[PDB]
């Protein structure tokens, strides 16, 4: 009675054959995962950086943003391990555009088959230039379509407490960042990381598009992402120390989100969070092993009226490209100074 | 590299044929929905009560509890519409027993096919005696197995913020209560009711067990459940006034959970919460239209028959006293409203 209808869906295995990953795409995803692992588990002293748009609505602009980011990654690879944000799924406050899978046409036609094709084509195009990607793992079905492409998964502030997303994370073959909750408190992420580290058994969709009982192995590469919230921002040295005091033995290093609840409603604050983070890093802070940045070709955002401006987010406001380059070069400087401190 | 394997799963349609609902089961589930709807939308001045075990681990014990509750429910029906907590799925802080469906043998062997069979035979056995049942809709696939037997579903405090659960709610055939968040504020529940009231498009599993694109109609029978949290309890008149101030036009009445956050880690606080909620109702508070109670045959919990293996519950005799007091308050609110 509250189901209007059911529309047929291509299976993951079918889409995978229709839109094959190239050798370079696969190698790139596996390398992004290796690097990310070595960073969050303390083998490598670079910083892991998840940077790029709040969301992708335009494959072409995303390809342009990706070329510029790959060129900067090649320059800064001694110091930073860069993964593009290629976020396909957007959790809303109430209602609103959910991303490129859900409504690729951004006009309320909900052509999900075309979204999945667009998403997977997008993921092959990005990783095919040797730039690893990451996305929020919001949907528990869509990762079957995409995950051979993905080097980093986030669980959002609004789904960190959810048992289903913890279950999902325990069966993903790549590192997973759990956001702290929207109230700004870290306990729920730390609990999520503990839960996701265990084996889970749950009903899930397989590559053939049918439900089966899944057993996961447990994901030892989950870590906490600090992204502020109601109680205040949490990127400063005191908030970090407070976070370090509640991590259990076995913990991975922390990531700091410059945007969202750490930006205080203003994308112009991302560079000021960077200054504070860099000062911690440059001074010896080893527990901060990653950062996340909402960056686009151009700054700010816009409403949805294809009468959209090029390279401008239609979800959260982003810093523009030239500011991103400043931010990243500053962070790379900071990473270098930390090595001096560590000797 | 992180999937240990897949085991075959009976489809929803198959289990519905193997464990068919009786005509009484079906009619009972329908009636429970009608009654819950009339109360939360203000058409009926009785209070809707979701009461029973924190979780079901024992079918026979649950039946015995259900027979007692059905008899109390007959006594008090002029004043309360009662739905049994038949909770199959338990969200954990980190890890631990997830309920009857996930691990019916409660010993880490996870026979989900037997858990779904036990769950469905349970839901049939309870509704077949004319008692409606409610459960937390934690798993988004599960409901395909059991929906047709359910009169109330809960989205729990740890999932009210989750877009997948708002989507799920938006396509459920029955009223849904969203708990406030574990920090104790209700904004996220208010946001969820707004979200679930809209039509959604999303990948879902159908009755023949394959993934398809679902379009829902949107669920206008969603309401907030007050269940306390880190910021404090929220069952008192100030909390209720603050809650009513937050509600949009077109809102349904509020439900107050006596337990979880509102019990401050002590199941013996449920009867005190009851007295506070009773005072408000008796004195004319018309926005409180629901309550939720964790109740079992015997009180407490454990890590022993008729005793919860999850959260601590009040026992059957206390349960009687609580609901008869609630019924009286409903009567007094009627007088106030004349
Ligand atoms: Co954003
Ligand atoms: Co409970």
From Swiss-Prot, chain A:
Stereospecific condensation of phosphoenolpyruvate (PEP) and D-erythrose-4-phosphate (E4P) giving rise to 3-deoxy-D-arabino-heptulosonate-7-phosphate (DAHP). This is Phospho-2-dehydro-3-deoxyheptonate aldolase, tyrosine-inhibited. Belongs to the class-I DAHP synthase family. GO terms for biological process: amino acid biosynthetic process; aromatic amino acid family biosynthetic process; chorismate biosynthetic process. PANTHER family: PHOSPHO-2-DEHYDRO-3-DEOXYHEPTONATE ALDOLASE DAHP SYNTHETASE, PHOSPHO-2-DEHYDRO-3-DEOXYHEPTONATE ALDOLASE, TYROSINE-INHIBITED. Its EC number is 2.5.1.54. GO terms for molecular function: 3-deoxy-7-phosphoheptulonate synthase activity. Pathway: Metabolic intermediate biosynthesis; chorismate biosynthesis; chorismate from D-erythrose 4-phosphate and phosphoenolpyruvate: step 1/7. Pfam families: DAHP_synth_1 (PF00793). The lineage of its organism: Eukaryota, Fungi, Dikarya, Ascomycota, Saccharomycotina.
From Swiss-Prot, chain B:
InterPro entries: Aldolase_TIM, DAHP1/KDSA, DAHP_synth_1. GO terms for molecular function: 3-deoxy-7-phosphoheptulonate synthase activity. It catalyses: D-erythrose 4-phosphate + phosphoenolpyruvate + H2O = 7-phospho-2-dehydro-3-deoxy-D-arabino-heptonate + phosphate. Pfam families: DAHP_synth_1. Inhibited by tyrosine. It comes from the Eukaryota. GO terms for biological process: amino acid biosynthetic process; aromatic amino acid family biosynthetic process; chorismate biosynthetic process. Pathway: Metabolic intermediate biosynthesis; chorismate biosynthesis; chorismate from D-erythrose 4-phosphate and phosphoenolpyruvate: step 1/7. Belongs to the class-I DAHP synthase family. Present with 26300 molecules/cell in log phase SD medium. This is Phospho-2-dehydro-3-deoxyheptonate aldolase, tyrosine-inhibited. The lineage of its organism: Eukaryota, Fungi, Dikarya, Ascomycota, Saccharomycotina.
């Amino acid at each position: 009675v509250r189901i209007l209808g059911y529309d047929p869906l291509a299976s993951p295995a079918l889409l995978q054959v229709q839109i094959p990953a190239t050798p370079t795409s696969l190698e790139t995803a596996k390398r992004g995962r290796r690097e990310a692992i070595d960073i969050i588990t303390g083998k490598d002293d670079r910083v892991l950086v998840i940077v790029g748009p709040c969301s992708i609505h335009d494959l072409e602009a995303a390809q342009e943003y990706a070329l510029r980011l790959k060129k900067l990654s090649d320059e800064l690879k001694g110091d930073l391990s860069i993964i593009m944000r290629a976020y396909l799924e957007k959790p809303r406050t109430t209602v609103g555009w959910k991303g490129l899978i859900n409504d690729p046409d951004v006009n309320n036609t909900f052509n999900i088959n075309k979204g999945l094709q667009s998403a997977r084509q997008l993921f092959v195009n990005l990783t095919n230039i040797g730039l690893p990607i990451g996305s929020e793992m919001l949907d528990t079905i869509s990762p079957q379509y995409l995950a051979d492409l993905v080097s980093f998964g986030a669980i959002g502030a609004r789904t960190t407490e959810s048992q289903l997303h913890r279950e999902l994370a325990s069966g993903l073959s790549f590192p997973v960042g759990f956001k702290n909750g929207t109230d700004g408190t870290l306990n729920v992420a730390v609990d999520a990381c503990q839960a996701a580290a265990h084996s889970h058994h749950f009903m899930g969709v397989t590559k053939h598009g049918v439900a089966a009982i899944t057993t996961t192995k447990g994901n030892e590469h989950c870590f906490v992402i600090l992204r502020g919230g109601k109680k205040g921002t949490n990127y400063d040295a005191k908030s970090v120390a407070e976070a370090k005091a509640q991590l259990p033995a076995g913990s991975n290093g922390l990531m700091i989100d410059y945007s969202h609840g750490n930006s205080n409603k203003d994308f112009r604050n991302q560079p000021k969070v960077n200054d504070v983070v860099c000062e911690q890093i440059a001074n010896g802070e080893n527990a901060i092993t990653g950062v996340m940045i909402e960056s686009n070709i151009n700054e700010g955002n816009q409403g949805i009226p294809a009468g959209l401006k090029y390279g401008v987010s239609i979800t959260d406001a982003c810093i523009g490209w030239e500011t991103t380059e400043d931010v990243l070069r500053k962070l790379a400087a900071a990473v270098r100074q930390r090595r001096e401190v560590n000797k």
